[PDB]
Design a protein around this nucleic acid. Structure first.
Lengths: 137, 138, 125
RNA sequence: UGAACGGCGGCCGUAACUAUAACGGUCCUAAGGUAGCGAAAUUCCUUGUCGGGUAAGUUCCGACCUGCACGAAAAGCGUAACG
RNA sequence: UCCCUGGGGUGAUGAGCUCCGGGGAGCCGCAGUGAACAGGCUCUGGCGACUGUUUACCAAAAACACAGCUCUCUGCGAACUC
RNA sequence: AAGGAGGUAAAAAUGGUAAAAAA
RNA sequence: GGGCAGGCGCCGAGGGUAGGGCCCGUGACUGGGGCGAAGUCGUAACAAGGUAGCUGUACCGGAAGGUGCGGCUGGAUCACCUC
RNA sequence: AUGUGGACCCGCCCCUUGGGGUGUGUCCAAAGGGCUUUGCCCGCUUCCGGAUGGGCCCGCGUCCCAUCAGCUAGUUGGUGGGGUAAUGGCCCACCAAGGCGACGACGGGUAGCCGGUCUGAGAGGAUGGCCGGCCACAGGGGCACUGAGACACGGGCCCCACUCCUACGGGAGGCAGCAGUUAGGAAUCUUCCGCAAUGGGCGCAAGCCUGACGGAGCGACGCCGCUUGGAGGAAGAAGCCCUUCGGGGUGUAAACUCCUGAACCCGGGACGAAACCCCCGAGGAGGGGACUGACGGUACCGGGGUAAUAGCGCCGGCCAACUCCGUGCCAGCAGCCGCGGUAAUACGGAGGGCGCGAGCGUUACCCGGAUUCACUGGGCGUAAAGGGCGUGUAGGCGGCCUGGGGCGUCCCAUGUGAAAGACCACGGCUCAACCGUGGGGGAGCGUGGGAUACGCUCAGGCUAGACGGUGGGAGAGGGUGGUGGAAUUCCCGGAGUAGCGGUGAAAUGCGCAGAUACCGGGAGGAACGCCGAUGGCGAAGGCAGCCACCUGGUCCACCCGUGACGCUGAGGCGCGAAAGCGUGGGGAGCAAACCGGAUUAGAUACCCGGGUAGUCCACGCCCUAAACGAUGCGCGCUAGGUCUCUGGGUCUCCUGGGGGCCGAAGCUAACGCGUUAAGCGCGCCGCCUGGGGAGUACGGCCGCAAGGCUGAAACUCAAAGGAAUUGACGGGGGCCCGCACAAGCGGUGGAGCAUG
């Protein structure tokens, strides 16, 4: 439990302050502080010293991975929000074409209005919901 | 009834003062007589005497007024500006020598009853004898 | 309350509450921390502000902020529990310092160097 | 006329992750199960899911509620004293 | 065990005899209500109100009983019943 | 019939519509 | 003569058995409350808010709300009995 | 043994808690050492007196929670005992029932107290570090001992834990002593010198121990003083910021000039130290000589001499100071209010300037402002708040007149209040900070005398407040029995037949199985029309036909009586709308819940049809509110004009008591109160201290239940709120008006066609 954790941040507080060497760096795209360093048996007897005079219960985990994602096809869809609540609606019919390109390119989008449809106040905020709903695959 | 025929007197005074009615009555007592004594005795009231109403001894008090000025209404000014009952029957004040107020710092008057009789600020301090602090007046 | 009742009872002293339980007499503390995030102040902002949870050397998961732009802080820093809420982050209490064990101010700062780190801008010229 | 024998619905959709559905539609009926209690002498999947109690708990208590098939006088619930 | 001591009772308000007792110190053992009779106890669910009543010949129970509740029938030749 | 005041009767078919804001 | 040791005995620290009393931390689950820009539903209060409102209370409903008893103006004017 | 003395014992004189003496009888002493020895130094023995510190005792003052209400059986008191320096149950025995409590016991949270100290005009709030006194602990607990003194920091025993030394048989240790290690924390130092000065212990001295003390070091942690320079020096050069291309600013600031001369070199050089000591005198007073510096050769004196550190917050208003690019509700400042959403004086950068300067900001902590728990110095009509109201316990306070008392109160004397600090004065180091001396003010309680004005205590008296006596009087004031009519549903009957019903419209509804409507008699229960009111009574919540019964409350008149019998009134008491409940009776109308109906998008609601709980009768139980005059109660004072209800008087009037309105003065922020005060004053109870959480939870008490009385907190927001003014706005209203209705005239919609 993460209660033992900050407790072992005190453990490290006297571990990273008696032996330079290693680097106690958390990962971003996953929680769990990572123990980086310059030695196999080194890191291991570190862990021993832990389970000796610091007694932590920490099922020494396998390092996790940051996983991005993508696609490979041109899909035309209908983002039609035909919903007229109690008068104000907030209805938004968005007709988008979506295109995919190389892994390493970057993020694109085009200021593409077929003639003059969607207001110029959605332009930097309709694509947000393209970005917004693209943090969660 | 009454808990303070003294402070009640002082009040009826305040009435006649604030209403401008030449004279007003207030029942028989020696102490009121002492006080009103002090009052005329420093040019404030117009006097007092042991009168009677219905068969009951009273003590009527006439009082002083100033000149009738114009402009902002005719209302002449008061002579007996204000009096405040200090030693209430809960705040039994007992001033002594080095004590004693200064009342309007210089003028006014303190009324205070001491070992010997009913004195005033300047008097009681001059005397060197003290007691209860009755009212203030200026 | 007529003198009597006043004497029988009492007009109680206001007391405080300390709108700032940094506690022990310790508004200076070892801010261990966890997380960073962003959060927003009422209807006219949006920023960063951390959350530094701290643990002090006595407890509490607070909301330790930061002295502004120029960050690193990751997860330890000894964020120096300090003090002062605003209309931002339902807390903003017990600020950070920069300097401490970590941060040491904005990369290049010319004013608030009394917390914003940078020593004495000797441009050596 | 129901402290009479008795009965006391189904199908679709809807909140800004998501999940859920106060909410609306709909075919049916005489009307669609109120409060309270609820994996119970009722729960099949089930040794259900969480929490305690243990070195370990299909048993037990507490709690969650998709009650296969609780429920109002074949009464529902709760109750100190007895068994 | 021994020293002292309280009141009921009978007889007299007492001797004797008897009931019920209070205290002080002292003696021996493994242990003294020394053997015979003689209760383990607490926590919490289930259900039933509770004492009880039932299957003589496998049952004692959460079934029946019950005080109590509503619903019905009975105007005296009661209605019910044989 | 002047006003003001003191107690008795009158009088809305239906309405959902928001909002950071501009001085 | 006694004295010291020794012997027994009083109180007694600590520990042990049981059951209370207060406080705190905590706990599946849960009531409620506060906070976040335009969420979904109705529109009760303020114009008689479109049924005058407000409320003690008791029964009811998705919810705000409703309604009976009574009370209260912080309710009501062609114009009705007077000041 | 010797026995001035001291001790006890029984008597005795004085005394009066165990103060001094005394008659009888017994117990007790002594230490001797030195030497210049026939004398003295140090010391001993018995007691009496001071000097000193402490023990015991009381007086007084001494934090928070009432959601801490009961506490106690060594408990309260005694006799006799034990023990201590000693009173005392502190401990034994025996024994009588007491002892503490809303003047807050008990329980718990918390704290070492003070002389002082920071803040505020002050009341006070807060605080108690170095320093001075009192207390308490020795790692935690008991424990005795030694002894003049202790429950003994560097002494003893035991137990506990804790840590170490060991050959693992055994043993040792307590830095809450002085530096120093380590954990802790954001943070609080040297493992230094001399006993030269003072002081403590010992010793005849010489002297010795002193981490007391007197000094050094470190840290801008505080206060204090001090240099980074002077003096000429430009319409002002350049460098840079700004600009409208004219310039402006930076700034005599800089450079150049002369001068002085921190730091630094050499030399001399401390006060801090004259006593103790030997010696002449006697070992006394006096007189002489001699020793004695840790700092440090630092202070400082003389001479030689170099211009020789500058930062920190701010520049939106509070709060003194603006221009320029960027940034673009992003990055961001922010004590408060907010500032930025592409021209930011608030962010970030740059010139300038405000401040402050060896310091400036930041947070934390406390006092103030905060008069914002109000004593000086607040409030309860509507913002926070009257307890629904009557009863009274205590308590709180009290009318006229005399005299005692001298408790409160006043005055002068006075003991103590140490020192230090506070103030003035003088002074010392070359100022300061800092220190040296003198003097006055000082709360407070002890002791003396005096004053009796005010409260009270005491005796006596008065009638103005209060009660009573007597006579008249008003009422829908409460408990009981009793009666009258109107009116609704219902039974029997009669007579009549196409509908009634209800509504905005209608329907559900009843009806040819004979309804709605009318008449004849019977049932029953519920509420009293008009009178009747802007009215009456009442403590409040309440009371409505009338008769009788019991019975309170109150009003005026007469001055007959009593003599302050008084006002309030924390708990306790009783009372109490309606709804709700229990046990029984009853039910006409009514009616929540419940069903139909119509309405709407929906109708669990308003409008309609039925219909139950319940609304009634008695006993009990709950006890709530807009219980609203939202205004406590009692009195006295301060304009009148009026409508009206009761009491008294020969009465077109006055006067007691009340009940509507107005408006002097006054009061209030305003509306509005204004002799029924929210005006001017005294007594007394309770209630309020930002909105929300919240009348929630907790504890505690009552309930049959639904609930109630008491009633916070964290956290959340910078507002909630009262009044009035404006302006809008309205499906409140009034008034006026127009081809609006009207009044009339010719049309549209229909046809074909034109065109939008």
């Amino acid at each position: 439990t993460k209660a033992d954790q900050e407790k072992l941040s005190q453990a490290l507080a006297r571990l990273a302050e008696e032996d330079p060497t290693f680097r106690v760096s958390t990962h971003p795209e996953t929680g769990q502080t990572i123990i980086s360093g310059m030695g196999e048996l080194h890191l291991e007897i570190i862990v021993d010293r832990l389970k000796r005079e610091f007694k932590v219960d920490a099922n020494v985990g396998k390092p996790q991975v940051a996983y991005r994602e993508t696609i490979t096809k041109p899909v035309d869809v209908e983002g039609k929000f035909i919903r007229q609540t109690g008068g104000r609606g907030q209805y938004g019919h968005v007709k988008i074409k979506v295109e995919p390109l190389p892994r390493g390119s970057g993020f694109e989008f085009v200021n593409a209005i077929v003639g003059g449809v969607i207001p110029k106040e959605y332009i930097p905020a309709v694509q947000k919901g393209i970005e917004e709903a693209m943090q969660s695959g | 009834m009454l808990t303070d025929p003294i402070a009640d007197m002082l009040t009826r005074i305040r009435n006649a003062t604030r209403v401008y009615k030449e004279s007003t009555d207030v029942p028989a007592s020696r102490f009121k007589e002492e006080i009103l004594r002090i009052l005329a005795r420093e040019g404030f009231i117009k006097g007092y005497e042991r009168v009677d109403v219905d068969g009951k001894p009273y003590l009527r008090v006439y009082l002083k007024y100033g000149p009738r000025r114009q402009g902002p209404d005719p209302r002449p000014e008061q002579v007996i500006h204000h009096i405040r009952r200090i030693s209430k029957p809960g705040r039994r004040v007992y001033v002594g020598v080095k004590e004693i107020p200064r009342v309007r710092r210089g003028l006014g008057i303190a009324i205070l009853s001491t070992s010997k009789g009913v004195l005033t600020d300047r008097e009681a301090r001059k005397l060197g004898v003290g007691g209860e602090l009755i009212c203030e007046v200026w | 309350p007529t003198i009597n009742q006043l004497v029988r009872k009492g007009r109680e002293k206001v007391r405080k509450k300390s709108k700032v339980p940094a506690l022990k007499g310790a508004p200076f503390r070892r801010g261990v921390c966890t997380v960073v995030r962003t959060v927003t102040p009422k209807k006219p902002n949006s920023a960063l502000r951390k959350v530094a949870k701290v643990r002090l050397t006595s407890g509490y998961e607070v909301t330790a902020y930061i002295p502004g732009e120029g960050h690193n802080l990751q997860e330890h820093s000894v964020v120096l529990i300090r003090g002062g809420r605003v209309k931002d982050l339902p807390g903003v209490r017990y600020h950070i310092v920069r300097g401490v064990y970590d941060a040491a101010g904005v990369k290049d700062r010319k004013k608030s160097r009394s917390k914003y780190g940078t020593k004495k801008p000797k441009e050596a010229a």
